Amino acid sequence: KVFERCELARTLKRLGMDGYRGISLANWMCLAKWESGYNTRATNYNAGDRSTDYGIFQINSRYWCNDGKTPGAVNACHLSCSALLQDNIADAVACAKRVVRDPQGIRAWIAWRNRCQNRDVRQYVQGCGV
């Protein structure tokens, strides 16, 4: 499923993301935007370390979800990576929350640093009623 901007904003808000561990909705929207273009089926294989990024938040197989094919990987969100490829984002949201509970917080995603950190991310939630 490829979400439309405001549709995703409300979907994330209903799921408890607005201010989760101090992270605004606009930040989560900027993250999903640059990670997958709001596409729940987005995937990216990393040939160098044999891991894969799954879903709308592009969560990595090495530490967060299990796909059975990543060397010495763990499954911190205790989910099948397949759960991160559903149209329904509840599981991906729970896993995204699991990721930010770590010390780095939203900074866990280097793309957030590159395109969202210290940026005007207002435009992502404007007019979405959130």
UniProtKB/Swiss-Prot annotation:
Record's keyword annotation contains Disulfide bond: yes
Q: Which residues are connected by disulfide bridges in this protein?
A: C6-C128, C30-C116, C65-C81, C77-C95
The disorder on record is:
Amyloidosis, hereditary systemic 5: A form of hereditary systemic amyloidosis, a disorder characterized by amyloid deposition in multiple tissues resulting in a wide clinical spectrum. AMYLD5 primarily affects the viscera, and the predominant clinical features are renal dysfunction of varying severity, and intra-abdominal bleeding. Inheritance is autosomal dominant.
In terms of SMART domains, this protein maps to: LYZ1 (SM00263)
Query: What is the species listed in this Swiss-Prot or TrEMBL entry?
Result: Homo sapiens (Human)
Q: Where in the cell is it found?
A: Secreted
Query: Mind listing the UniProt keywords for this protein, alphabetically?
Result: Amyloid, Amyloidosis, Antimicrobial, Bacteriolytic enzyme, Disease variant, Disulfide bond, Glycosidase, Hydrolase, Secreted, Signal
Q: What else is known?
A: Lysozyme C is capable of both hydrolysis and transglycosylation; it also shows a slight esterase activity. It acts rapidly on both peptide-substituted and unsubstituted peptidoglycan, and slowly on chitin oligosaccharides.
Family designation:
Belongs to the glycosyl hydrolase 22 family.
GO biological process per UniProt: antimicrobial humoral response; defense response to bacterium; defense response to Gram-negative bacterium; defense response to Gram-positive bacterium; inflammatory response; killing of cells of another organism
Subunit arrangement? Monomer.
Q: Per UniProt, what is the name of the gene that codes for the protein in this document?
A: LYZ
This chain belongs to the protein called Lysozyme C
